[PDB]
XYZ file of C-alpha atoms in Angstrom:
585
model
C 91.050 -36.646 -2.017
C 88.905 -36.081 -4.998
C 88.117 -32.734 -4.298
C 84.956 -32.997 -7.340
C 83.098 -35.492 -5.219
C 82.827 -33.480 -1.947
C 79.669 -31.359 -1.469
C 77.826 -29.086 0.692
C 74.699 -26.830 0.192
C 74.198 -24.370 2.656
C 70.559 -24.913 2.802
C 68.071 -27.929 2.087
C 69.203 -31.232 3.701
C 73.042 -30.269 3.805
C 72.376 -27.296 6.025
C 69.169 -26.477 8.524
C 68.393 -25.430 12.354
C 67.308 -27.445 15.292
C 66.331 -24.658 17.395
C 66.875 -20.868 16.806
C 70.392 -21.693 18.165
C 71.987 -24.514 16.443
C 72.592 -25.575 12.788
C 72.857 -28.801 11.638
C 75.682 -28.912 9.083
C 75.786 -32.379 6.873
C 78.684 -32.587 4.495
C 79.236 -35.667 2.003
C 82.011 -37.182 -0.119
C 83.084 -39.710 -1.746
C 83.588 -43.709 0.202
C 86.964 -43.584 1.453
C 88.823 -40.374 0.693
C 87.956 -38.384 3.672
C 88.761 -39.655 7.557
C 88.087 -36.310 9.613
C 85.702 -33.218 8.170
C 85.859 -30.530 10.707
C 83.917 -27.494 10.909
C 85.502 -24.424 11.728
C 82.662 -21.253 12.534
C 82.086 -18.425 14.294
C 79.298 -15.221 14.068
C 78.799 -13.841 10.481
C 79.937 -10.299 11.984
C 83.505 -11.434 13.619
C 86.338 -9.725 13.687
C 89.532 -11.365 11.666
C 91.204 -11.787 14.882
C 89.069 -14.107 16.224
C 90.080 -17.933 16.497
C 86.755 -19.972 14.931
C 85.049 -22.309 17.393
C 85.210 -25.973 16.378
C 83.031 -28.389 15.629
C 83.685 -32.245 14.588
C 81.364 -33.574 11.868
C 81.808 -36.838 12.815
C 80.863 -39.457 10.092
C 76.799 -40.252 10.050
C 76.274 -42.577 7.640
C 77.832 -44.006 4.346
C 76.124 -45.676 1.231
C 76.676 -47.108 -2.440
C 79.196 -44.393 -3.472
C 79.477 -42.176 -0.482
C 80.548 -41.124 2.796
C 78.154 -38.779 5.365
C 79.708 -36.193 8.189
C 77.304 -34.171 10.075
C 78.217 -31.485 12.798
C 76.226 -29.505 14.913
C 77.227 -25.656 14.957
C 76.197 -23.546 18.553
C 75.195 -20.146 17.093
C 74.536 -18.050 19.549
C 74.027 -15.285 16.953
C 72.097 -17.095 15.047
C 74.065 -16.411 12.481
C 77.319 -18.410 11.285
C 80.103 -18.468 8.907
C 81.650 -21.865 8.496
C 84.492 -23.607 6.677
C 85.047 -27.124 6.456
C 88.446 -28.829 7.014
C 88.930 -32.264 5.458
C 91.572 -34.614 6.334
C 92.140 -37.298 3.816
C 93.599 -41.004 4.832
C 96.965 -40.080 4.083
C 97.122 -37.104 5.648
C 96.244 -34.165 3.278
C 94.296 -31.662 4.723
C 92.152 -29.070 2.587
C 89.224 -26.469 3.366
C 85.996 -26.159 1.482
C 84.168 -23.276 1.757
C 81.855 -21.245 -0.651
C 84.764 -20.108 -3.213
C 86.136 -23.477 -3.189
C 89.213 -25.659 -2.284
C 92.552 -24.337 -0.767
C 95.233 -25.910 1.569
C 94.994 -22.175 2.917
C 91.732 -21.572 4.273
C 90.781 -17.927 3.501
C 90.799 -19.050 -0.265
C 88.314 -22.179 0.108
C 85.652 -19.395 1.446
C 83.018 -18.985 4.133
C 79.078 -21.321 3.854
C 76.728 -18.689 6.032
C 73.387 -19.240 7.058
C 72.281 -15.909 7.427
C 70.199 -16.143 9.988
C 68.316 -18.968 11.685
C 64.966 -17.257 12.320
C 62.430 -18.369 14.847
C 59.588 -19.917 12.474
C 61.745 -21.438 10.354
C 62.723 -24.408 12.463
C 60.946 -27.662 10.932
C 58.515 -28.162 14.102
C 56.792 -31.826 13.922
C 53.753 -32.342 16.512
C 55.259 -34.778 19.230
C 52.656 -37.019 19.088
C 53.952 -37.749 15.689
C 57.513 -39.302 17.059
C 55.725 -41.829 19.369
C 53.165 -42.969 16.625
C 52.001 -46.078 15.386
C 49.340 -45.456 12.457
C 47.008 -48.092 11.173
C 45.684 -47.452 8.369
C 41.548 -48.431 8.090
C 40.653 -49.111 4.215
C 37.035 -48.764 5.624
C 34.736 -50.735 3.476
C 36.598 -53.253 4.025
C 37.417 -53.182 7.919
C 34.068 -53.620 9.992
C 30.556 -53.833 8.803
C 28.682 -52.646 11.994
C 25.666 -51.362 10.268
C 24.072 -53.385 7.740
C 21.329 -50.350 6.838
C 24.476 -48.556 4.887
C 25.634 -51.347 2.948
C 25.588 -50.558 -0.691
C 22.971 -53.024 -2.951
C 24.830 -55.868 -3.684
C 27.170 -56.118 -0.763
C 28.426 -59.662 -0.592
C 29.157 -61.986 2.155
C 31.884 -61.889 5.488
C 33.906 -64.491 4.568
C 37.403 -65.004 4.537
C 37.457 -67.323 1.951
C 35.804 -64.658 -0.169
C 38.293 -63.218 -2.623
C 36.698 -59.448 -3.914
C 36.128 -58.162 -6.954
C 37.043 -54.309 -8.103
C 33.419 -53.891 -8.063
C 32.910 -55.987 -4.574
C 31.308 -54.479 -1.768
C 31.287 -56.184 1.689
C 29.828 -53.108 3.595
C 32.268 -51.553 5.997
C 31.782 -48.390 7.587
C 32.736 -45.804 10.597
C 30.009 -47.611 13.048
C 32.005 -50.896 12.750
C 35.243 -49.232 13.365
C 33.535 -47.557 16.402
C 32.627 -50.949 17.590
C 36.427 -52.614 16.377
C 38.562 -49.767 18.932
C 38.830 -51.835 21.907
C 40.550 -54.129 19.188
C 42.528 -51.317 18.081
C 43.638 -49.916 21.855
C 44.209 -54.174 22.148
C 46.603 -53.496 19.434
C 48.367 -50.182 20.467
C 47.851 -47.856 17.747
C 48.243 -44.379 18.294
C 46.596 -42.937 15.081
C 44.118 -43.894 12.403
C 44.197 -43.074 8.968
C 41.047 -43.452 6.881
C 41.510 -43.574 2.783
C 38.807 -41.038 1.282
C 35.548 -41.677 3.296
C 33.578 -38.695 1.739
C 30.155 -38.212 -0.389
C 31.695 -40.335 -3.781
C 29.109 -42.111 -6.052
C 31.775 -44.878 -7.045
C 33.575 -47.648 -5.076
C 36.715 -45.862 -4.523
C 36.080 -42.232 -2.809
C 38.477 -40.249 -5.244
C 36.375 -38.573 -7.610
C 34.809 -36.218 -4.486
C 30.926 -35.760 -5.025
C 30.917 -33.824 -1.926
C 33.433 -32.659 0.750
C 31.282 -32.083 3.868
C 29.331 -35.270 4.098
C 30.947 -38.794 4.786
C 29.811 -41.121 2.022
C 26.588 -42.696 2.744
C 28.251 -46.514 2.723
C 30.446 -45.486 5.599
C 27.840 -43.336 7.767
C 27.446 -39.551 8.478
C 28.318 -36.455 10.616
C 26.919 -37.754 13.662
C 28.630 -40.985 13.486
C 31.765 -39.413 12.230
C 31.566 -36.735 15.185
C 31.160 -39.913 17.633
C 34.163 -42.106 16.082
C 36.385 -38.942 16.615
C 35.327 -38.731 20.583
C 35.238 -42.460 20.829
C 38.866 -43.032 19.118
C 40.401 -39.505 21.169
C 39.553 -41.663 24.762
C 41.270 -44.324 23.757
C 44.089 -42.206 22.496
C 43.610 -42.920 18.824
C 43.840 -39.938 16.536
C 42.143 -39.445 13.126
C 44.145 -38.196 9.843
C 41.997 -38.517 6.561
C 42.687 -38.680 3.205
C 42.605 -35.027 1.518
C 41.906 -35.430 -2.760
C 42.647 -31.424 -3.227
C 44.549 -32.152 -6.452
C 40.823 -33.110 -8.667
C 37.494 -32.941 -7.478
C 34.830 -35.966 -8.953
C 32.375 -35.316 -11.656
C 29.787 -34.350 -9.748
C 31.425 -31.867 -7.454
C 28.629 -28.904 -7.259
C 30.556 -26.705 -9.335
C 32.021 -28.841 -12.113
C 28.111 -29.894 -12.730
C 27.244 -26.108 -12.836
C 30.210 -25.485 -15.921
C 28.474 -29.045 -17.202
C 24.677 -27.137 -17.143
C 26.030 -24.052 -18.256
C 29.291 -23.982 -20.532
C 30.817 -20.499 -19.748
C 27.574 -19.220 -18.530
C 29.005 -20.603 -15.476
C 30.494 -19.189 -12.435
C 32.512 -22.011 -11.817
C 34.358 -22.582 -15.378
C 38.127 -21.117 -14.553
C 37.940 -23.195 -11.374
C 38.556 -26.371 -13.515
C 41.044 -25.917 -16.730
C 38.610 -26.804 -19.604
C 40.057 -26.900 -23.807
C 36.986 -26.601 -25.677
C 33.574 -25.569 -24.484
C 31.000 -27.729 -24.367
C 32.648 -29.879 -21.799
C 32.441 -33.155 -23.580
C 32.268 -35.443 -20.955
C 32.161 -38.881 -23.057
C 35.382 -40.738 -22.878
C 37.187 -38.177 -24.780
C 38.379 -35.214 -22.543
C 38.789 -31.740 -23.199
C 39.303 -30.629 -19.613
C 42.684 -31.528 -17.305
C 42.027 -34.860 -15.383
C 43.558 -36.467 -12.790
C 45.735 -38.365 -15.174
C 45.526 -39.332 -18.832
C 42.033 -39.386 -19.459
C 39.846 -39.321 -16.435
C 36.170 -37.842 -17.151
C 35.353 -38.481 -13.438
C 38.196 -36.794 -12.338
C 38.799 -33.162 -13.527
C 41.830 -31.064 -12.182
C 40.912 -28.428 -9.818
C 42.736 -25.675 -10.542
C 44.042 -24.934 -7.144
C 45.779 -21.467 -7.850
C 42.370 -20.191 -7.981
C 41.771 -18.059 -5.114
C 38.703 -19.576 -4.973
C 38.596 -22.924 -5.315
C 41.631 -22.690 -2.923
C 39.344 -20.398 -0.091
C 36.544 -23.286 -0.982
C 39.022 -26.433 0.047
C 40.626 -24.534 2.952
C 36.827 -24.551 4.039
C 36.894 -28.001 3.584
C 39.734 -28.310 6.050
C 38.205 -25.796 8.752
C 35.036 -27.951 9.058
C 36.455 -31.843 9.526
C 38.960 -29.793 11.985
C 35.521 -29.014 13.294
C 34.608 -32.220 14.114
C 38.204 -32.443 15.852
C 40.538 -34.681 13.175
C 43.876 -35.053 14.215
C 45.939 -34.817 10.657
C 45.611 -35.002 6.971
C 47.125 -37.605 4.731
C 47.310 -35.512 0.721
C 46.864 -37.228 -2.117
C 48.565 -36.183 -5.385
C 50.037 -33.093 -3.160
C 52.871 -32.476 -5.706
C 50.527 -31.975 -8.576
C 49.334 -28.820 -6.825
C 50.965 -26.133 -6.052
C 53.410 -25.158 -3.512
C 51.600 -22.010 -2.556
C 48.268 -23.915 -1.703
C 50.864 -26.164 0.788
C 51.992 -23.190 2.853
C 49.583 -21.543 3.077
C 47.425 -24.769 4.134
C 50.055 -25.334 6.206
C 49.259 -22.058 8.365
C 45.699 -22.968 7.951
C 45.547 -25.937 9.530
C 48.723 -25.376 11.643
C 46.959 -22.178 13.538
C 43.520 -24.184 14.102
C 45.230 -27.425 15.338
C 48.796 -27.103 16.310
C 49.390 -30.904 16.463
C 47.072 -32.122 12.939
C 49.951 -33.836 11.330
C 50.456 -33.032 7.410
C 51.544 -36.195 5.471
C 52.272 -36.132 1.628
C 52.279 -38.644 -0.622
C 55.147 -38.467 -3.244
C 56.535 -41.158 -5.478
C 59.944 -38.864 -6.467
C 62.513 -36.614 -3.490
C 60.397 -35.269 -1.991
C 62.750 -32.213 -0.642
C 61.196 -29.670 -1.605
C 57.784 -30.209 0.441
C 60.242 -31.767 3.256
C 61.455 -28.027 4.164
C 59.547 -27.340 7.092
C 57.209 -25.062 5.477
C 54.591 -27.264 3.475
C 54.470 -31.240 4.890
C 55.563 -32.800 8.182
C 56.328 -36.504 6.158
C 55.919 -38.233 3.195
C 54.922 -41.997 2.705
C 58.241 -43.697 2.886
C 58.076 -45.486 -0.526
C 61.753 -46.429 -0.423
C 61.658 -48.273 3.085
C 58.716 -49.694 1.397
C 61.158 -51.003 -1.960
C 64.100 -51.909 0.298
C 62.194 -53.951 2.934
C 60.949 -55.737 -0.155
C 64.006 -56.696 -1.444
C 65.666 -57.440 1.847
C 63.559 -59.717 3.934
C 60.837 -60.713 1.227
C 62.053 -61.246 -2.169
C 66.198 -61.802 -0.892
C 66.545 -59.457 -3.798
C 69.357 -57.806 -2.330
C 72.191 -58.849 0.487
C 72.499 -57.114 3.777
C 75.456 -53.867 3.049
C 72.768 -53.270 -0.345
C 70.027 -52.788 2.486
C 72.512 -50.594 4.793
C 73.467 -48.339 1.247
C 70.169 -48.156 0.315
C 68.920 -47.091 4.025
C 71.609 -44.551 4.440
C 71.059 -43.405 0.556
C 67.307 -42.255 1.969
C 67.893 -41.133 5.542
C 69.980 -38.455 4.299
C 67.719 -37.275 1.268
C 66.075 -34.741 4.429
C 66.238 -33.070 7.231
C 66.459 -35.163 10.257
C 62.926 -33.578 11.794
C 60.953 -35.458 8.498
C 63.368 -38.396 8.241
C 62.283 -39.157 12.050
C 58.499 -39.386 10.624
C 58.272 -40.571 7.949
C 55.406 -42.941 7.185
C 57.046 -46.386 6.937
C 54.813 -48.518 5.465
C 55.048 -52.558 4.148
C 52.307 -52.127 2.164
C 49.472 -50.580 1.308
C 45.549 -50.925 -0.371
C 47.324 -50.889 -3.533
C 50.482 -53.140 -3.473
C 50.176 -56.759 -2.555
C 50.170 -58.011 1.263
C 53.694 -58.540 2.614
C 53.368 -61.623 3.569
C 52.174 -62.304 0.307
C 55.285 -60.723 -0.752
C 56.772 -63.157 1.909
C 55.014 -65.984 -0.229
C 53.492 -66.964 3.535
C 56.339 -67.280 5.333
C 56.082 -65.514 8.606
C 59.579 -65.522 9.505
C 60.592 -63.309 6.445
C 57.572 -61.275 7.695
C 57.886 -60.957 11.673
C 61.625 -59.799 10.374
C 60.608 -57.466 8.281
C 57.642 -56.000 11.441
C 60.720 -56.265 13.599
C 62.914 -53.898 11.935
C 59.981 -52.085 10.867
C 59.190 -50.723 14.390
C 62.634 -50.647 15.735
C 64.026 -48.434 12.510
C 63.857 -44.369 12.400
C 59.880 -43.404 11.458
C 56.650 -43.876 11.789
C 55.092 -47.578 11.487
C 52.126 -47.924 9.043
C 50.289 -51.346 10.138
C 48.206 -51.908 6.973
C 44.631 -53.479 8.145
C 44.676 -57.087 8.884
C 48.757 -57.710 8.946
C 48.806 -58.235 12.659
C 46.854 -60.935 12.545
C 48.334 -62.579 9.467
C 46.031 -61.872 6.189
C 47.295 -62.417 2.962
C 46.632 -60.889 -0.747
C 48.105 -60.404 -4.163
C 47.780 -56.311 -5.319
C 44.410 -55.064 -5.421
C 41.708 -56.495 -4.872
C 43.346 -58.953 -3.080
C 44.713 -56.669 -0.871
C 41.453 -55.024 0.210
C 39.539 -58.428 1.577
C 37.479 -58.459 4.517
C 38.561 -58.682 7.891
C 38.945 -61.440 9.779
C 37.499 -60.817 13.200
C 36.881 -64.473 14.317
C 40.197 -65.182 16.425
C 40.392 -68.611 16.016
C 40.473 -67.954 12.073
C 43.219 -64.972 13.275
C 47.041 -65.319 14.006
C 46.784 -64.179 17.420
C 50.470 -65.609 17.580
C 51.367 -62.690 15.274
C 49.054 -59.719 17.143
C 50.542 -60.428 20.630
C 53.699 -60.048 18.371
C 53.342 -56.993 17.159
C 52.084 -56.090 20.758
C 55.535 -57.002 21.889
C 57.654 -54.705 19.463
C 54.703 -51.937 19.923
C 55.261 -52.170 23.367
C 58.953 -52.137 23.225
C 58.544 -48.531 20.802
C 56.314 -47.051 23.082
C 58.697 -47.830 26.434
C 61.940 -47.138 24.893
C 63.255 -43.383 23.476
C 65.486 -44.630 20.874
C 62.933 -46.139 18.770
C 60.803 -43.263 18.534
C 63.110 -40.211 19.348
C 67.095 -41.598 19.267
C 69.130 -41.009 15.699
C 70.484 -44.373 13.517
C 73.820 -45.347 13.090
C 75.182 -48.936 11.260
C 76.741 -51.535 13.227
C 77.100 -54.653 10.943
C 76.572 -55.370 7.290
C 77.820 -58.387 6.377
C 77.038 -59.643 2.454
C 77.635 -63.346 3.132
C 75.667 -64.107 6.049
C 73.231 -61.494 5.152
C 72.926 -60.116 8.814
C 72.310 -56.371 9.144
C 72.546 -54.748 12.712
C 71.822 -51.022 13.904
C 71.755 -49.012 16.499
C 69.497 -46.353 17.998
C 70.268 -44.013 20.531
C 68.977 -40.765 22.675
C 70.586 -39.584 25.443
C 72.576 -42.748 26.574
C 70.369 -45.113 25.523
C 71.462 -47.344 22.676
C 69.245 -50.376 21.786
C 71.139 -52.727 18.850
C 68.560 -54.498 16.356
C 70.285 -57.272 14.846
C 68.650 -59.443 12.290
C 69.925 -62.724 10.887
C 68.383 -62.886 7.478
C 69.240 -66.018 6.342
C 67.723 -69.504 6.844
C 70.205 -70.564 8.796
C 71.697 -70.402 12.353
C 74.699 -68.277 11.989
C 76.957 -66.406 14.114
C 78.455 -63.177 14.711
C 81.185 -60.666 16.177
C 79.985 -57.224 16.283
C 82.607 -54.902 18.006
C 80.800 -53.220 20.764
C 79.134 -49.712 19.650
C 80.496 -45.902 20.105
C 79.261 -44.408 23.489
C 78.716 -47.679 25.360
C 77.538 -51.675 27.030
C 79.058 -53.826 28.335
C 76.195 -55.812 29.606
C 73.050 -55.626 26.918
C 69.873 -57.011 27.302
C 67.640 -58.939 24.521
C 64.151 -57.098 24.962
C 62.223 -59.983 23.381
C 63.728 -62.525 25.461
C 66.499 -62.504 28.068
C 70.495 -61.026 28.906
C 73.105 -60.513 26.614
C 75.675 -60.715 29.331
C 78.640 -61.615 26.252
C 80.784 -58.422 26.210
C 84.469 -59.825 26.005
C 87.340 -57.552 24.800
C 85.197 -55.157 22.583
C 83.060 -57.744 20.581
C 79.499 -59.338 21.663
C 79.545 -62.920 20.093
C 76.046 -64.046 19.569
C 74.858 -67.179 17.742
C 71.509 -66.441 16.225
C 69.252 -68.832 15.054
C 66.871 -68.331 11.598
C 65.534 -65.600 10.773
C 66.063 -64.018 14.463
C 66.015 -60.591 15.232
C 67.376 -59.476 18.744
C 66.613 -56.106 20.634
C 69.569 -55.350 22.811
C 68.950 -52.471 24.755
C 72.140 -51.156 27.456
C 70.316 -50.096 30.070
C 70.339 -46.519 29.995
């Protein structure tokens, strides 16, 4: 084996509970050289002359340039000592521990986990597994109050292609009016990009953190969209700007009136007094140069206590979650301790970060729930809409991210196609929906949460911003209601079956000439098989039947898979087809 390719924290992703009992040990090495890890443990206390219990870390996943085993240690104790044995294809057989390498295992070492206390077990809310999030850009979504639009909104149209200065007058009394649209649909959540008190188009240089923006409405309409969405069992996360507050934020005008007269100077990070707003900064901004944007200076106990009052009040009005923007320019203090905020006021508010970079370190369990999946994002991209890469690149690149976290985030994170800043996906597609109903296929069949961007269910289109963020199409015979009943099919199929939400993901076929990629997901004994053709052309394959069982499977979009013969299902599957074959259990 080479022994210098083999790895193992005992922390982080490598190491971490699932209950106060049980540790989930993952162990990786290098493609090939390693056939059987086992994991050999027993209490941190025990006596030389006891015999280890066992535990096989089977093999999890595998990618680029390596090779995943995970095990699952019973402690009892909650506390464990551990050594790894690793069988190599020939037949070596060598122990890594914390001093190192030896065919004799007391000199490769112990990995302990001190203790596996009570708290620290990454809880997610379980709403969160289940979800479906669709995520309202909301001057753009509904217009259902024509008193708030701002002057110069333009015209509904759908041949209407914005401007960055375009306004078309959405707001939260046309999404209140759009929900029966939205139940139609199946979403489970909402999440709004920053609706609050903002003077300019886009709400991230905050004027004022307790009043929704006059464009989109007020507290009392706010209030009502929150019980109107909760009976249809829609949930509300909103976008938190903590990182900088806007030009006019009550305070940053006070240092503006006052130089360091003011009581609010050290709660922004200013060079030079006078604060020179011109073009030319001499205070932190949000990122180069930003006048409208200065840096809060969140390790300020007050401007945090101030923002944390900000939380306490839209929890007031009953939000379900918060979606942070620019969370890993602030601090990881703030995050905890938010965390406990907002996690002892609402037990089930979901926390999602948004993080362009690992994001490991906010993925412990103790500051963020998820992150915004960019690299489903840049994989599903190259797979199904630019053919950019071939189908074992996709399965590399999948099991390169699952494994960057522990399993409790990797199950939720936010897994989007695109967003109000990238270009549509079908636009990414260049219009061709079978590339996209693929790519919606696998995207709520795979391990996280599905993002529907507003307006992809029923087929809009758009090059990046502002072509991205152009009105809604609510006439249905201008709508692909061929695609929404579509993505009512898979959403259905999530919601009624536990391995799509809940069950773990394991390969099944890569293949880099036919460009088919197949997986399966599975909870208890349940094991539904997504296989995609991703080519243009009818092909054909032998998949060898998966680990714990089928014989009989049956295609959940249309109709039985009957074709179990001799430990391979032969199925011939036409362009761009994906199949659903659940077993049964």
């Amino acid at each position: 084996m080479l022994l210098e390719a083999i790895f193992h924290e005992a922390k982080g992703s490598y190491a971490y509970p699932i209950s106060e009992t049980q540790l989930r040990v993952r162990l990786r090495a290098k493609k090939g050289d390693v056939v059987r890890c086992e994991v050999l443990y027993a209490d941190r206390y025990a006596s030389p002359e006891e015999e280890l219990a066992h535990a096989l870390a089977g093999k999890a996943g595998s990618d680029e340039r390596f090779d995943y085993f995970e095990a699952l240690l019973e402690c009892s104790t909650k506390r464990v000592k551990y050594v790894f044995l690793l069988t190599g294809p020939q037949g070596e057989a060598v122990y890594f521990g914390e001093t190192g390498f030896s065919a004799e295992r007391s000199k490769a070492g112990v990995f302990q986990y001190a203790y596996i206390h009570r708290s620290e077990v990454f809880t997610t809310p379980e709403w969160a597994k289940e979800a479906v999030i669709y995520q309202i850009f909301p001057e753009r979504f509904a217009n259902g109050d024509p008193s708030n639009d701002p002057p110069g909104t333009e015209q509904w149209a759908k041949d209407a292609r914005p401007r960055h200065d375009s306004f078309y007058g959405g707001d939260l009394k046309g999404v209140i009016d759009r929900l029966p649209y939205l139940e139609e649909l199946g979403v489970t959540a909402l999440y709004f990009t920053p609706i609050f008190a903002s003077p300019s188009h886009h709400k991230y240089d905050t004027a004022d953190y307790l009043a929704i923006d006059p464009q989109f409405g007020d507290l009392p309409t706010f209030r009502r969209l929150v019980d109107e969405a909760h009976r249809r069992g829609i949930k509300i996360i909103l976008d938190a700007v903590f990182n900088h507050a806007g030009d006019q934020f009550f305070a940053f005008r006070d240092v503006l009136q006052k130089g360091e007269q003011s009581r609010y100077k050290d709660w922004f990070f200013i060079e030079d007094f006078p604060v020179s707003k011109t073009s030319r900064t001499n205070y932190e901004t949000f990122a180069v140069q930003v006048p409208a944007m200065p840096k809060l200076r969140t390790e300020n106990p007050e401007v945090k206590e101030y923002l944390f009052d900000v939380a306490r009040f839209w929890m007031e009005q009953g939000i379900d979650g918060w979606r942070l923007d620019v969370a890993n320019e602030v601090d990881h203090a703030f995050w905890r301790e938010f965390r406990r905020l907002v996690k002892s006021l609402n037990p089930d508010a979901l926390i999602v970060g948004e993080i362009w970079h690992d994001a490991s370190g906010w993925l412990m369990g103790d500051q963020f729930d998820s992150v915004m999946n960019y690299l489903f994002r840049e994989s599903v991209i190259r797979f199904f809409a630019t053919g950019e890469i071939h189908a074992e690149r996709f399965d590399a690149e999948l099991t390169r991210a699952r494994m960057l976290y522990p399993e409790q985030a990797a199950q939720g994170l936010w897994n989007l196609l695109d967003s109000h800043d990238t270009e549509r996906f079908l636009t990414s597609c260049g219009g061709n929906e079978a590339k996209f109903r693929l790519a919606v296929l696998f995207q709520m069949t795979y391990l996280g949460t599905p993002l529907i961007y507003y307006g992809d269910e029923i087929g809009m289109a758009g090059a990046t911003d502002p072509d991205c963020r152009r009105p809604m199409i609510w006439e249905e015979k201008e709508q692909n209601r061929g695609l929404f009943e579509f993505y009512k099919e898979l959403i259905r199929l999530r919601h009624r079956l536990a391995s799509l939400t809940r069950g773990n993901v394991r390969s099944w076929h890569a293949d880099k000439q036919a460009n088919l990629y197949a997986f399966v997901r599975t909870v208890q004994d349940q094991h539904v098989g997504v296989v995609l053709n991703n080519r243009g052309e009818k092909q054909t394959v032998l998949l060898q039947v998966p680990e714990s069982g089928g014989k009989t499977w049956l295609d959940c979009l249309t109709g039985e898979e009957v074709h179990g013969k001799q430990g391979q299902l032969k199925l011939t599957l036409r362009p761009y087809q994906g199949m659903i074959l659940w077993n049964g259990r």
